[PDB]
Short mmCIF file of C-alpha atoms in Angstrom, two decimals:
data_model
loop_
_atom_site.label_atom_id
_atom_site.label_comp_id
_atom_site.label_asym_id
_atom_site.label_seq_id
_atom_site.Cartn_x
_atom_site.Cartn_y
_atom_site.Cartn_z
CA UNK U 1 -98.76 -34.72 3.82
CA UNK U 2 -95.23 -33.33 3.97
CA UNK U 3 -92.27 -34.55 6.01
CA UNK U 4 -88.70 -33.33 6.59
CA UNK U 5 -85.65 -35.22 7.87
CA UNK U 6 -83.70 -33.14 10.46
CA UNK U 7 -80.10 -34.19 11.13
CA UNK U 8 -78.08 -33.15 14.16
CA UNK U 9 -75.55 -34.33 16.72
CA UNK U 10 -77.82 -36.71 18.67
CA UNK U 11 -78.29 -37.05 22.43
CA UNK U 12 -79.38 -34.24 24.74
CA UNK U 13 -78.70 -31.54 22.14
CA UNK U 14 -80.88 -33.15 19.49
CA UNK U 15 -83.59 -33.94 22.05
CA UNK U 16 -83.61 -30.21 22.88
CA UNK U 17 -83.82 -29.35 19.17
CA UNK U 18 -86.76 -31.72 18.76
CA UNK U 19 -88.49 -30.23 21.80
CA UNK U 20 -87.80 -26.56 21.05
CA UNK U 21 -87.92 -26.58 17.21
CA UNK U 22 -89.59 -29.66 15.71
CA UNK U 23 -92.59 -30.06 18.02
CA UNK U 24 -93.79 -26.39 17.88
CA UNK U 25 -93.20 -26.33 14.13
CA UNK U 26 -95.22 -29.55 13.54
CA UNK U 27 -98.06 -28.32 15.75
CA UNK U 28 -98.22 -25.08 13.72
CA UNK U 29 -97.63 -26.39 10.19
CA UNK U 30 -98.76 -30.03 10.11
CA UNK U 31 -95.34 -30.98 8.64
CA UNK U 32 -93.76 -34.08 10.17
CA UNK U 33 -90.15 -33.84 11.33
CA UNK U 34 -88.23 -37.11 11.54
CA UNK U 35 -85.06 -37.06 13.68
CA UNK U 36 -81.97 -38.53 12.03
CA UNK U 37 -78.17 -38.31 12.18
CA UNK U 38 -75.58 -37.92 13.38
CA UNK U 39 -74.22 -35.11 11.22
CA UNK U 40 -71.50 -36.54 9.05
CA UNK U 41 -69.92 -34.30 6.42
CA UNK U 42 -68.86 -37.26 4.25
CA UNK U 43 -72.41 -38.69 4.13
CA UNK U 44 -73.74 -35.20 3.24
CA UNK U 45 -71.31 -34.70 0.33
CA UNK U 46 -71.97 -38.24 -0.90
CA UNK U 47 -75.79 -38.01 -1.01
CA UNK U 48 -75.59 -34.61 -2.70
CA UNK U 49 -73.19 -35.94 -5.35
CA UNK U 50 -75.31 -39.08 -5.92
CA UNK U 51 -78.46 -36.96 -6.42
CA UNK U 52 -80.34 -39.10 -3.84
CA UNK U 53 -80.64 -36.72 -0.87
CA UNK U 54 -82.23 -38.24 2.27
CA UNK U 55 -81.38 -35.23 4.55
CA UNK U 56 -83.49 -32.06 4.43
CA UNK U 57 -82.17 -29.89 7.26
CA UNK U 58 -78.71 -30.41 8.76
CA UNK U 59 -76.98 -28.86 11.77
CA UNK U 60 -73.28 -28.28 10.91
CA UNK U 61 -70.29 -26.34 12.29
CA UNK U 62 -69.68 -22.89 10.73
CA UNK U 63 -66.39 -23.97 9.13
CA UNK U 64 -68.19 -26.72 7.23
CA UNK U 65 -71.06 -24.41 6.29
CA UNK U 66 -68.61 -22.10 4.51
CA UNK U 67 -66.73 -24.95 2.80
CA UNK U 68 -69.95 -26.68 1.69
CA UNK U 69 -71.35 -23.43 0.30
CA UNK U 70 -68.10 -22.97 -1.67
CA UNK U 71 -68.21 -26.59 -2.94
CA UNK U 72 -71.80 -26.08 -4.25
CA UNK U 73 -73.30 -28.64 -1.79
CA UNK U 74 -76.12 -26.48 -0.36
CA UNK U 75 -79.45 -24.95 -1.43
CA UNK U 76 -79.49 -21.10 -1.41
CA UNK U 77 -81.86 -20.11 1.41
CA UNK U 78 -85.23 -18.49 0.69
CA UNK U 79 -85.29 -15.12 2.43
CA UNK U 80 -88.91 -14.56 1.43
CA UNK U 81 -89.66 -17.00 4.27
CA UNK U 82 -86.65 -16.70 6.61
CA UNK U 83 -86.43 -13.25 8.24
CA UNK U 84 -82.79 -12.50 7.39
CA UNK U 85 -82.77 -9.15 9.23
CA UNK U 86 -83.44 -10.80 12.60
CA UNK U 87 -80.40 -13.07 12.57
CA UNK U 88 -77.08 -12.16 14.15
CA UNK U 89 -75.27 -10.63 11.12
CA UNK U 90 -72.23 -12.82 11.87
CA UNK U 91 -74.11 -16.10 11.42
CA UNK U 92 -76.26 -15.71 8.29
CA UNK U 93 -75.30 -16.15 4.63
CA UNK U 94 -76.85 -17.15 1.30
CA UNK U 95 -76.55 -20.82 2.25
CA UNK U 96 -76.99 -20.95 6.05
CA UNK U 97 -78.72 -19.60 9.15
CA UNK U 98 -77.25 -19.65 12.66
CA UNK U 99 -78.44 -22.52 14.81
CA UNK U 100 -76.80 -21.45 18.08
CA UNK U 101 -73.57 -20.21 19.69
CA UNK U 102 -71.46 -22.37 21.97
CA UNK U 103 -68.02 -22.76 23.56
CA UNK U 104 -65.52 -25.45 24.17
CA UNK U 105 -65.02 -25.25 27.94
CA UNK U 106 -62.85 -27.17 30.40
CA UNK U 107 -64.94 -29.79 32.21
CA UNK U 108 -63.80 -31.78 35.24
CA UNK U 109 -65.13 -34.24 37.87
CA UNK U 110 -59.47 -27.37 41.03
CA UNK U 111 -58.56 -26.92 37.26
CA UNK U 112 -58.47 -23.38 35.89
CA UNK U 113 -57.35 -23.20 32.26
CA UNK U 114 -56.20 -25.39 29.40
CA UNK U 115 -52.71 -25.68 30.98
CA UNK U 116 -54.37 -28.08 33.45
CA UNK U 117 -54.82 -30.66 30.66
CA UNK U 118 -51.03 -30.74 30.43
CA UNK U 119 -50.17 -31.12 34.12
CA UNK U 120 -50.71 -34.81 34.96
CA UNK U 121 -48.67 -34.35 38.17
CA UNK U 122 -50.99 -31.76 39.75
CA UNK U 123 -54.22 -33.08 38.21
CA UNK U 124 -54.20 -36.91 37.68
CA UNK U 125 -56.37 -38.87 35.23
CA UNK U 126 -57.15 -39.34 31.52
CA UNK U 127 -58.02 -36.23 29.45
CA UNK U 128 -61.00 -36.07 27.03
CA UNK U 129 -60.47 -34.36 23.65
CA UNK U 130 -62.43 -34.28 20.38
CA UNK U 131 -61.35 -36.99 17.90
CA UNK U 132 -62.34 -35.18 14.67
CA UNK U 133 -60.06 -32.60 12.97
CA UNK U 134 -61.99 -29.48 13.76
CA UNK U 135 -61.53 -26.06 15.47
CA UNK U 136 -60.70 -26.55 19.16
CA UNK U 137 -57.94 -29.02 20.10
CA UNK U 138 -55.09 -27.44 18.13
CA UNK U 139 -56.08 -23.97 19.38
CA UNK U 140 -56.30 -24.99 23.04
CA UNK U 141 -52.95 -26.77 22.75
CA UNK U 142 -51.35 -23.57 21.46
CA UNK U 143 -52.98 -21.53 24.24
CA UNK U 144 -51.69 -23.97 26.85
CA UNK U 145 -48.23 -23.62 25.30
CA UNK U 146 -48.25 -19.85 25.90
CA UNK U 147 -49.45 -18.52 22.49
CA UNK U 148 -51.57 -15.37 23.19
CA UNK U 149 -55.21 -15.29 21.99
CA UNK U 150 -54.65 -12.67 19.29
CA UNK U 151 -51.76 -14.60 17.70
CA UNK U 152 -53.34 -18.06 17.18
CA UNK U 153 -53.81 -17.81 13.42
CA UNK U 154 -52.51 -19.21 11.27
CA UNK U 155 -52.06 -22.29 13.45
CA UNK U 156 -48.47 -23.27 14.19
CA UNK U 157 -49.21 -26.96 13.65
CA UNK U 158 -45.74 -28.30 14.51
CA UNK U 159 -45.91 -26.55 17.89
CA UNK U 160 -49.47 -27.76 18.54
CA UNK U 161 -48.65 -31.42 17.83
CA UNK U 162 -45.49 -31.17 19.96
CA UNK U 163 -47.61 -29.92 22.88
CA UNK U 164 -50.19 -32.68 22.43
CA UNK U 165 -47.35 -35.25 22.28
CA UNK U 166 -46.52 -34.50 25.92
CA UNK U 167 -49.80 -36.20 26.90
CA UNK U 168 -50.64 -38.48 23.95
CA UNK U 169 -50.75 -41.56 26.22
CA UNK U 170 -53.28 -39.92 28.54
CA UNK U 171 -55.77 -38.73 25.90
CA UNK U 172 -59.12 -40.42 25.45
CA UNK U 173 -60.72 -39.32 22.17
CA UNK U 174 -64.44 -38.58 22.02
CA UNK U 175 -66.13 -38.90 18.62
CA UNK U 176 -69.59 -37.59 19.61
CA UNK U 177 -71.39 -35.57 22.30
CA UNK U 178 -72.89 -38.62 24.01
CA UNK U 179 -69.53 -40.35 24.34
CA UNK U 180 -67.96 -37.23 25.80
CA UNK U 181 -70.73 -37.13 28.41
CA UNK U 182 -70.25 -40.80 29.27
CA UNK U 183 -66.47 -40.37 29.55
CA UNK U 184 -66.88 -37.61 32.10
CA UNK U 185 -70.01 -38.80 33.95
CA UNK U 186 -68.28 -42.07 34.74
CA UNK U 187 -64.81 -41.40 36.00
CA UNK U 188 -63.16 -42.63 32.80
CA UNK U 189 -61.56 -39.18 32.33
CA UNK U 190 -61.02 -36.57 35.06
CA UNK U 191 -61.00 -33.52 32.81
CA UNK U 192 -61.28 -32.42 29.19
CA UNK U 193 -62.60 -30.20 26.38
CA UNK U 194 -66.40 -30.34 25.98
CA UNK U 195 -69.22 -28.54 24.24
CA UNK U 196 -70.64 -26.41 27.07
CA UNK U 197 -74.24 -27.59 26.58
CA UNK U 198 -73.19 -31.21 27.05
CA UNK U 199 -71.75 -30.33 30.47
CA UNK U 200 -74.94 -28.42 31.28
CA UNK U 201 -76.96 -31.56 30.42
CA UNK U 202 -74.80 -33.63 32.82
CA UNK U 203 -75.14 -31.07 35.64
CA UNK U 204 -78.94 -31.05 35.36
CA UNK U 205 -78.84 -34.89 35.59
CA UNK U 206 -77.17 -34.62 38.97
CA UNK U 207 -73.66 -35.59 37.82
CA UNK U 208 -70.97 -33.82 39.94
CA UNK U 209 -69.14 -31.92 37.19
CA UNK U 210 -67.47 -28.51 37.11
CA UNK U 211 -66.54 -26.05 34.36
CA UNK U 212 -63.97 -23.31 33.93
CA UNK U 213 -64.82 -20.63 31.35
CA UNK U 214 -61.22 -19.33 31.21
CA UNK U 215 -60.19 -19.11 27.53
CA UNK U 216 -63.52 -20.58 26.42
CA UNK U 217 -63.48 -21.21 22.66
CA UNK U 218 -66.48 -19.77 20.81
CA UNK U 219 -68.01 -21.29 17.69
CA UNK U 220 -71.40 -21.36 15.99
CA UNK U 221 -73.48 -24.10 14.40
CA UNK U 222 -75.40 -23.42 11.19
CA UNK U 223 -78.60 -24.91 9.79
CA UNK U 224 -78.15 -25.81 6.11
CA UNK U 225 -80.33 -27.47 3.48
CA UNK U 226 -78.40 -30.03 1.27
CA UNK U 227 -78.64 -29.36 -2.49
CA UNK U 228 -81.21 -31.64 -4.16
CA UNK U 229 -83.51 -31.94 -1.12
CA UNK U 230 -86.90 -33.36 -2.04
CA UNK U 231 -88.57 -31.10 0.54
CA UNK U 232 -87.10 -27.64 -0.16
CA UNK U 233 -90.18 -25.58 0.72
CA UNK U 234 -90.79 -27.41 4.00
CA UNK U 235 -87.10 -27.20 4.98
CA UNK U 236 -87.16 -23.43 4.56
CA UNK U 237 -90.26 -23.09 6.75
CA UNK U 238 -88.38 -25.09 9.40
CA UNK U 239 -85.32 -22.83 9.22
CA UNK U 240 -87.71 -19.87 9.65
CA UNK U 241 -89.15 -21.40 12.80
CA UNK U 242 -85.87 -22.61 14.34
CA UNK U 243 -84.09 -19.30 13.76
CA UNK U 244 -86.93 -17.14 15.17
CA UNK U 245 -86.60 -15.41 18.56
CA UNK U 246 -88.92 -17.94 20.21
CA UNK U 247 -87.18 -21.02 18.78
CA UNK U 248 -83.78 -19.61 19.76
CA UNK U 249 -84.96 -18.72 23.28
CA UNK U 250 -86.53 -22.10 23.89
CA UNK U 251 -83.51 -24.02 22.60
CA UNK U 252 -81.23 -21.84 24.75
CA UNK U 253 -83.36 -22.51 27.85
CA UNK U 254 -83.04 -26.29 27.34
CA UNK U 255 -79.28 -26.49 26.66
CA UNK U 256 -77.39 -23.38 27.90
CA UNK U 257 -76.29 -22.70 24.34
CA UNK U 258 -76.55 -19.04 23.28
CA UNK U 259 -79.30 -17.83 20.86
CA UNK U 260 -78.42 -16.09 17.58
CA UNK U 261 -81.55 -14.01 16.97
CA UNK U 262 -81.17 -10.30 17.72
CA UNK U 263 -84.65 -10.33 19.33
CA UNK U 264 -83.75 -13.13 21.73
CA UNK U 265 -83.51 -12.12 25.39
CA UNK U 266 -79.80 -12.08 26.11
CA UNK U 267 -79.63 -13.49 29.64
CA UNK U 268 -76.37 -14.30 31.44
CA UNK U 269 -77.77 -17.30 33.31
CA UNK U 270 -80.73 -19.66 32.99
CA UNK U 271 -81.68 -18.86 36.61
CA UNK U 272 -82.60 -15.30 35.55
CA UNK U 273 -86.36 -14.82 35.09
CA UNK U 274 -87.14 -14.42 31.37
CA UNK U 275 -90.30 -12.37 31.03
CA UNK U 276 -92.62 -12.26 28.01
CA UNK U 277 -96.06 -10.72 27.43
CA UNK U 278 -99.21 -12.83 27.49
CA UNK U 279 -101.53 -10.65 25.39
CA UNK U 280 -104.43 -13.13 25.56
CA UNK U 281 -104.59 -13.16 29.39
CA UNK U 282 -103.57 -9.48 29.66
CA UNK U 283 -100.52 -10.41 31.73
CA UNK U 284 -97.11 -12.04 31.46
CA UNK U 285 -95.41 -15.42 31.40
CA UNK U 286 -91.96 -16.26 32.68
CA UNK U 287 -89.51 -19.16 32.59
CA UNK U 288 -86.27 -19.86 34.44
CA UNK U 289 -84.22 -22.70 35.92
CA UNK U 290 -83.06 -22.34 39.52
CA UNK U 291 -80.17 -24.50 40.76
CA UNK U 292 -79.61 -25.80 44.33
CA UNK U 293 -76.42 -27.36 45.77
CA UNK U 294 -76.99 -30.89 47.12
CA UNK U 295 -74.92 -31.99 50.15
CA UNK U 296 -73.58 -34.98 48.14
CA UNK U 297 -71.80 -32.43 45.93
CA UNK U 298 -74.18 -32.39 42.95
CA UNK U 299 -76.62 -29.67 41.85
CA UNK U 300 -80.39 -30.10 41.62
CA UNK U 301 -82.40 -28.18 39.03
CA UNK U 302 -85.79 -26.58 39.54
CA UNK U 303 -87.56 -25.73 36.31
CA UNK U 304 -89.95 -22.81 36.75
CA UNK U 305 -92.99 -21.92 34.59
CA UNK U 306 -94.87 -18.81 35.66
CA UNK U 307 -98.06 -17.00 34.58
CA UNK U 308 -99.24 -13.68 36.06
CA UNK U 309 -102.75 -12.25 35.53
CA UNK U 310 -104.09 -8.92 36.90
CA UNK U 311 -106.79 -9.10 39.58
CA UNK U 312 -108.20 -5.65 38.72
CA UNK U 313 -110.02 -4.54 35.58
CA UNK U 314 -107.72 -1.55 35.12
CA UNK U 315 -105.23 -1.04 32.24
CA UNK U 316 -101.83 -2.68 32.70
CA UNK U 317 -98.37 -2.44 31.14
CA UNK U 318 -97.65 -5.37 28.80
CA UNK U 319 -93.82 -5.57 28.47
CA UNK U 320 -91.40 -6.24 25.67
CA UNK U 321 -89.24 -9.30 26.34
CA UNK U 322 -86.60 -8.81 29.06
CA UNK U 323 -85.26 -10.51 32.21
CA UNK U 324 -84.74 -10.01 35.96
CA UNK U 325 -81.35 -10.32 37.67
CA UNK U 326 -81.49 -11.48 41.29
CA UNK U 327 -78.86 -11.72 44.03
CA UNK U 328 -80.08 -13.62 47.10
CA UNK U 329 -78.48 -14.18 50.53
CA UNK U 330 -79.91 -16.70 53.01
CA UNK U 331 -78.97 -16.44 56.69
CA UNK U 332 -80.12 -17.27 60.24
CA UNK U 333 -81.22 -15.06 63.13
CA UNK U 334 -79.17 -16.38 66.12
CA UNK U 335 -81.96 -15.37 68.53
CA UNK U 336 -84.71 -17.24 66.60
CA UNK U 337 -85.49 -20.68 68.02
CA UNK U 338 -88.08 -21.63 65.37
CA UNK U 339 -87.31 -23.05 61.90
CA UNK U 340 -86.83 -19.87 59.88
CA UNK U 341 -85.11 -18.05 57.04
CA UNK U 342 -83.63 -14.55 56.84
CA UNK U 343 -83.51 -13.46 53.20
CA UNK U 344 -81.87 -10.42 51.60
CA UNK U 345 -82.50 -9.86 47.87
CA UNK U 346 -81.66 -7.43 45.08
CA UNK U 347 -83.76 -7.59 41.90
CA UNK U 348 -83.00 -5.53 38.78
CA UNK U 349 -84.65 -5.59 35.35
CA UNK U 350 -82.30 -5.88 32.37
CA UNK U 351 -81.85 -7.16 28.80
CA UNK U 352 -82.83 -4.07 26.87
CA UNK U 353 -79.82 -1.84 26.20
CA UNK U 354 -80.02 1.79 27.23
CA UNK U 355 -80.74 3.76 24.02
CA UNK U 356 -82.30 7.11 22.97
CA UNK U 357 -85.17 5.38 21.18
CA UNK U 358 -86.09 3.38 24.30
CA UNK U 359 -87.17 6.42 26.42
CA UNK U 360 -94.17 8.08 35.48
CA UNK U 361 -95.72 5.20 33.60
CA UNK U 362 -98.55 3.88 35.81
CA UNK U 363 -100.54 4.98 38.83
CA UNK U 364 -99.36 1.86 40.68
CA UNK U 365 -95.70 2.79 40.10
CA UNK U 366 -96.29 5.64 42.61
CA UNK U 367 -97.03 3.18 45.45
CA UNK U 368 -93.40 1.98 45.46
CA UNK U 369 -91.42 5.25 45.63
CA UNK U 370 -90.76 4.69 49.35
CA UNK U 371 -90.10 1.74 51.67
CA UNK U 372 -93.12 -0.57 51.77
CA UNK U 373 -93.93 -3.21 54.47
CA UNK U 374 -94.43 -6.75 53.18
CA UNK U 375 -96.40 -9.71 54.53
CA UNK U 376 -96.04 -13.21 53.10
CA UNK U 377 -98.33 -16.06 54.17
CA UNK U 378 -97.99 -19.52 52.61
CA UNK U 379 -100.11 -22.64 53.19
CA UNK U 380 -98.41 -25.72 51.84
CA UNK U 381 -99.02 -29.44 51.28
CA UNK U 382 -96.20 -31.64 49.97
CA UNK U 383 -96.93 -35.38 49.64
CA UNK U 384 -99.53 -34.88 52.37
CA UNK U 385 -97.15 -33.11 54.81
CA UNK U 386 -99.01 -29.89 55.78
CA UNK U 387 -97.16 -26.75 56.88
CA UNK U 388 -97.48 -22.97 57.11
CA UNK U 389 -94.98 -20.14 56.63
CA UNK U 390 -95.33 -16.47 57.59
CA UNK U 391 -92.82 -13.79 56.69
CA UNK U 392 -92.53 -10.03 57.34
CA UNK U 393 -90.12 -7.28 56.26
CA UNK U 394 -89.70 -4.35 53.86
CA UNK U 395 -89.35 -3.77 50.12
CA UNK U 396 -87.61 -0.84 48.45
CA UNK U 397 -88.38 -0.80 44.73
CA UNK U 398 -86.09 2.18 44.14
CA UNK U 399 -83.04 0.00 44.90
CA UNK U 400 -84.83 -3.30 44.27
CA UNK U 401 -84.03 -4.36 47.87
CA UNK U 402 -86.01 -7.00 49.82
CA UNK U 403 -85.33 -7.82 53.48
CA UNK U 404 -87.52 -10.55 54.98
CA UNK U 405 -87.73 -13.00 57.88
CA UNK U 406 -89.81 -16.17 57.39
CA UNK U 407 -91.06 -18.46 60.17
CA UNK U 408 -92.48 -21.94 59.77
CA UNK U 409 -95.47 -21.57 62.08
CA UNK U 410 -96.31 -25.31 62.20
CA UNK U 411 -93.02 -26.72 63.55
CA UNK U 412 -90.25 -28.22 61.36
CA UNK U 413 -90.40 -27.25 57.68
CA UNK U 414 -90.82 -30.54 55.73
CA UNK U 415 -88.90 -29.17 52.72
CA UNK U 416 -85.62 -27.16 52.47
CA UNK U 417 -85.94 -23.38 52.76
CA UNK U 418 -84.05 -22.79 49.45
CA UNK U 419 -86.84 -24.53 47.52
CA UNK U 420 -89.37 -21.98 48.86
CA UNK U 421 -87.40 -18.82 48.05
CA UNK U 422 -88.95 -18.19 44.61
CA UNK U 423 -92.50 -18.89 45.83
CA UNK U 424 -92.15 -16.70 48.96
CA UNK U 425 -92.91 -10.09 45.08
CA UNK U 426 -91.52 -9.06 41.72
CA UNK U 427 -93.30 -5.73 42.09
CA UNK U 428 -90.18 -4.74 44.07
CA UNK U 429 -87.72 -5.03 41.14
CA UNK U 430 -85.79 -1.92 40.15
CA UNK U 431 -86.82 -1.05 36.61
CA UNK U 432 -84.26 1.38 35.04
CA UNK U 433 -85.84 4.57 33.66
CA UNK U 434 -85.67 3.40 30.02
CA UNK U 435 -87.60 0.26 31.04
CA UNK U 436 -90.32 1.63 33.34
CA UNK U 437 -92.82 1.08 30.47
CA UNK U 438 -92.22 -2.69 30.89
CA UNK U 439 -93.09 -3.00 34.59
CA UNK U 440 -96.21 -5.13 34.59
CA UNK U 441 -95.89 -5.93 38.29
CA UNK U 442 -96.26 -2.36 39.59
CA UNK U 443 -98.85 -1.49 36.93
CA UNK U 444 -101.37 -4.01 38.30
CA UNK U 445 -101.24 -2.45 41.79
CA UNK U 446 -103.00 -1.87 44.05
CA UNK U 447 -105.68 -4.33 42.97
CA UNK U 448 -102.81 -6.80 42.46
CA UNK U 449 -102.14 -9.91 40.37
CA UNK U 450 -102.40 -13.70 40.58
CA UNK U 451 -99.09 -15.55 40.28
CA UNK U 452 -99.18 -19.23 39.28
CA UNK U 453 -96.18 -21.52 38.88
CA UNK U 454 -95.16 -25.10 38.18
CA UNK U 455 -91.75 -25.93 39.66
CA UNK U 456 -90.31 -29.28 38.51
CA UNK U 457 -87.34 -30.71 40.44
CA UNK U 458 -85.20 -32.99 38.24
CA UNK U 459 -85.70 -36.65 39.28
CA UNK U 460 -88.16 -35.66 42.01
CA UNK U 461 -91.58 -34.07 42.50
CA UNK U 462 -93.37 -30.90 41.39
CA UNK U 463 -94.63 -27.82 43.26
CA UNK U 464 -97.82 -26.16 41.98
CA UNK U 465 -98.32 -22.63 43.35
CA UNK U 466 -101.12 -20.05 43.27
CA UNK U 467 -100.54 -16.66 44.91
CA UNK U 468 -102.35 -13.33 45.19
CA UNK U 469 -100.07 -10.30 45.41
CA UNK U 470 -102.01 -7.17 46.36
CA UNK U 471 -102.04 -4.22 48.75
CA UNK U 472 -104.04 -4.58 51.95
CA UNK U 473 -103.91 -1.07 53.36
CA UNK U 474 -100.22 -0.06 53.34
CA UNK U 475 -98.87 -3.61 53.26
CA UNK U 476 -97.95 -5.51 50.13
CA UNK U 477 -99.29 -8.98 50.75
CA UNK U 478 -98.26 -12.22 49.07
CA UNK U 479 -100.70 -15.02 50.04
CA UNK U 480 -99.80 -18.44 48.63
CA UNK U 481 -101.29 -21.93 48.34
CA UNK U 482 -98.66 -24.56 47.43
CA UNK U 483 -99.36 -28.22 46.48
CA UNK U 484 -96.42 -30.60 45.97
CA UNK U 485 -96.84 -34.11 44.52
CA UNK U 486 -94.72 -37.15 43.59
CA UNK U 487 -91.71 -36.46 45.81
CA UNK U 488 -89.40 -39.22 47.05
CA UNK U 489 -89.62 -39.41 50.85
CA UNK U 490 -85.86 -40.10 50.91
CA UNK U 491 -85.04 -37.64 48.08
CA UNK U 492 -83.15 -34.33 48.14
CA UNK U 493 -86.30 -32.40 49.09
CA UNK U 494 -88.25 -34.46 51.61
CA UNK U 495 -84.98 -35.87 53.04
CA UNK U 496 -83.33 -32.42 53.44
CA UNK U 497 -80.15 -32.93 51.40
CA UNK U 498 -79.81 -29.35 50.06
CA UNK U 499 -77.26 -26.85 51.35
CA UNK U 500 -78.62 -23.75 53.06
CA UNK U 501 -77.45 -21.19 50.48
CA UNK U 502 -77.87 -19.84 46.93
CA UNK U 503 -74.32 -20.63 45.76
CA UNK U 504 -75.31 -22.75 42.72
CA UNK U 505 -76.80 -19.57 41.24
CA UNK U 506 -73.64 -17.43 41.59
CA UNK U 507 -71.63 -18.72 38.59
CA UNK U 508 -73.55 -17.92 35.34
CA UNK U 509 -74.00 -20.82 32.92
CA UNK U 510 -74.56 -19.14 29.52
CA UNK U 511 -71.67 -18.31 27.11
CA UNK U 512 -72.80 -14.70 26.94
CA UNK U 513 -71.69 -14.15 30.55
CA UNK U 514 -68.04 -14.84 29.74
CA UNK U 515 -67.30 -12.53 26.80
CA UNK U 516 -64.17 -11.30 28.61
CA UNK U 517 -62.80 -14.86 28.59
CA UNK U 518 -63.96 -15.82 25.08
CA UNK U 519 -61.59 -16.58 22.22
CA UNK U 520 -63.12 -16.59 18.73
CA UNK U 521 -62.30 -19.76 16.78
CA UNK U 522 -61.51 -18.77 13.24
CA UNK U 523 -64.04 -20.58 11.13
CA UNK U 524 -62.95 -18.83 7.93
CA UNK U 525 -59.43 -20.15 8.54
CA UNK U 526 -60.90 -23.62 9.06
CA UNK U 527 -63.08 -23.35 5.98
CA UNK U 528 -59.97 -22.81 3.82
CA UNK U 529 -57.45 -25.02 5.63
CA UNK U 530 -59.64 -27.80 7.13
CA UNK U 531 -58.87 -30.56 4.53
CA UNK U 532 -55.10 -30.00 4.77
CA UNK U 533 -55.17 -29.98 8.58
CA UNK U 534 -57.31 -33.14 8.55
CA UNK U 535 -54.63 -34.94 6.50
CA UNK U 536 -51.92 -33.80 8.95
CA UNK U 537 -54.13 -34.66 11.96
CA UNK U 538 -55.00 -38.18 10.73
CA UNK U 539 -51.28 -38.87 10.02
CA UNK U 540 -50.39 -37.69 13.55
CA UNK U 541 -53.13 -39.79 15.08
CA UNK U 542 -51.47 -43.15 14.45
CA UNK U 543 -47.86 -42.04 15.08
#
């Protein structure tokens, strides 16, 4: 029996790493993974120097990964086991593999960029900043003081400290991710610098927190294996698993950090449907997280798991990994007296770049060249409240346009309309020419497909859905049975506390959607200068 000790930053991030990396890896390999930490560079150096290494795999910042490799603290990685070619070229080396990409972002309980941390008059309250000498604080201070992005390095330290001085009294230092989350989730600070994923975690927990991505500061974490590890072979197998496309995708989906495998689907937002082939069932699976604005000002998450299986016996297109991008608009018909929803949607397939090497693909594709009438019928049961919904309209696959009106035929809808949107015809997505080979949905027509989902609402119940999507004559029909269980009668769903819109889905939540606003933190600079800055930082910290 073999066991590895995995060391990370604790809290929601480490929970996600356990769930997305450790659990799958243990299942597959029979190797136990024990969760330890937090990452502490001192403790790492010390155990390496003493020759009694207790830590097998450690999550570290890129600056430290370079320094530690230079100081001889790390095992050289075994690229017979880790697929080096699949890792973002920027975040792989002889002594490290990329763990994930993230940003420091400005979190608040109105504020637009780092200058807001310095204006206590306009924006009152304490400000949260990272306690440890490390890329981020000095840079954002310089940016707030008018230094342009491209002229940050080398850091003008005197100027940065002078800028921080103007607010020293109002700074609350955070030493760890958990503390930063507590500082913001309670009102102890009003604003600050946070790891983006930590803010994501708070949002999904119903905390009312906002983010600006202006001048977001990009950095990467690296998985390293401390020199002298007693479990070298097992550590390497773990790095292989965690750095694979699947491990990266799953970790990204749980945290809103960005994956670092070139084969990972590069979505802009976790609400976009990530599609993968299910060879065994001759169909596809999908995953995504929808968000809904609550009237109290928070945001409620809806975690979707989807499986689609062809009804017919015919041959179908099994896609390469990609995603769907959806814009939805909810509205009301002023002349409609029943409980109802008017929905307008655009769906486009994306996530494979147009290339020469990537270029009619199925008989079913031909059924969608024109405008096609749609009928949706749903029979639902949520906590024993029965209800029916019927919708009609048209689909235009060429433009990926859906226009639909839905009626609740049984009276008042016992749930909010927004929560039914995703249940209430992906065969209408526009697939670009270079991607038509990846359109499972159209390929299964006209016999159709079965669409099954689990939708979990954070801190509330679950919908379970089973739908048949097929042609009946000229009409594309989506017939659905929905069963909902374990809802709170006074919760956001059964107590109708959700806004009638799709606004929570408008602002993307992954770092990859804000390249234009990114600033690259210079981890090579920090590798070389870190110790000297630390000295200066520690001195300044008690002045």
